[PDB]
């Protein structure tokens, strides 16, 4: 996994190293790398319009519009992440990078989806936004995933980008934080991942000029050795703390 620190347009070292990785993993790479690289003309892909909240939308409607915008950007399968996200950057500068995303319109992976999730949900203060991170185990490997948890009018949900349809957006229909988290765990069971750790962040402030970093891990719990009855408790205490604006 390579990340582009060159900005736009992309400089030659990082560009070539993308086609590098693309020609190795593809069983018929190189044959097809040339066909894109060397082609006098390519179709100019459609630029999706960035959604704006209109008074005829419910919150679920706006949330689906944000998620549909991200799906149109597409998940990044190229191997080269195009927008660098430094997790502990001030919120202010991550928002600058989200602006980059909407204005450059390129594929994105899960972390960048979360930043853009935040950027598109600033401006609706009925929605609270907080990152959910998962460490999971499959076949002798550990993997890391992240989504945007969502809380609004007593219901929980998520926005996200994933290669798997069941590990991104979740409608605003879960009555506890635990029901949300437990849906992800069951979704991971479909792909034979065991959830080892779950990290819940803090509400992301709606000040887009905040220079504080996002809090990614106020709660960390080792769901592997824990029973569901006790995962629920630990998660339910923490969600309620979030709502009572203690944490």
């Amino acid at each position: 996994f390579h990340v582009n620190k060159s900005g736009f347009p992309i400089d030659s070292h990082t560009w070539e190293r993308m086609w590098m990785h693309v020609a190795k993993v593809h069983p018929k790479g190189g044959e097809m790398v040339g066909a894109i690289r060397n082609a006098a003309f390519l179709a100019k892909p459609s630029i999706p319009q960035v959604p704006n909240y209109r008074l005829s939308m419910t919150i679920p409607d706006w949330l689906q519009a944000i998620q549909n915008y991200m799906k149109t950007l597409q998940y990044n399968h190229t191997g080269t992440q195009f927008f660098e996200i430094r997790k502990m950057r001030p919120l202010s500068g991550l928002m600058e990078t989200a602006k980059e995303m909407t204005r450059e319109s390129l594929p994105i992976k899960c972390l960048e989806a979360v930043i853009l999730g935040i950027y598109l949900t600033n401006g609706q203060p009925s929605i609270e936004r907080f990152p959910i991170s998962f460490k999971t185990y499959f076949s002798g490997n550990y993997f890391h995933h992240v989504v945007l948890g969502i809380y609004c009018n007593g219901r929980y949900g998520s926005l996200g980008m994933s290669r798997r349809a069941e590990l991104m957006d979740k409608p605003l229909t879960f009555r506890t934080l635990s029901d949300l988290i437990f849906d992800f765990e069951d979704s991971y069971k479909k792909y034979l991942h065991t959830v080892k750790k779950v990290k819940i962040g803090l509400y992301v402030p709606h000040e887009p000029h905040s220079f504080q970093p996002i809090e990614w891990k106020q709660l960390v719990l080792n769901v592997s050795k824990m029973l569901r009855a006790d995962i629920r408790k630990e998660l339910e205490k923490y969600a309620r703390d979030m709502r009572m604006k203690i944490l």
């Binding site: 693309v22 593809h26 191997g79 319109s105 390129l106």
Partner: protein, 33 residues
């Protein structure tokens, strides 16, 4: 003439992304099978 580089690279990136998506489904399908 710097924008033109973006627009072309965008067009190549989406072109390439189509292929890796279609690849990843055949890989995942033949996995299952």
């Amino acid at each position: 003439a710097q924008q033109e580089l973006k627009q072309r690279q965008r067009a190549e990136i989406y072109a390439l992304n189509r292929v890796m998506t279609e690849l990843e489904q055949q890989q995942f399908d033949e996995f299952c099978k």
